[PDB]
Amino acid sequence: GAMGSCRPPMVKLVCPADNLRAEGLECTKTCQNYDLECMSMGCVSGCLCPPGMVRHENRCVALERCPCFHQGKEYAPGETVKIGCNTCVCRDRKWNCTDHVCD
């Protein structure tokens, strides 16, 4: 289940038999699995951004270009929201709060 398309072929990658070729690296990376181990891959052939990138919302972005996720809702990155008295700006996948406090 990947609800995707691959009309234009980039390159054909053939599944090995005795697995003595192992592509040439380890499992792929995603904004979620970047640090979360992937379960042994089963000849899952697919197309996507070249190596060194991660998958997000079917949109190809790099770990740096990965935005901040807000409870199912995704607000444009580099922007800010108000949570009570303290406010912060979405930068680097984590909340970057200004520095001041209301306590």
Curated annotation (Swiss-Prot):
Region (Amino-terminal): 5-26
UniProt domain TIL: residue ranges: 15-66
Region: E1, residue numbers: 27-72
Disulphides: C6-C47, C15-C43, C49-C60
Region: CX, residue numbers: 65-92
Segments traversing the membrane: none
The name this protein goes by in its record: von Willebrand factor
Naturally occurring in which organism (per UniProt): Homo sapiens
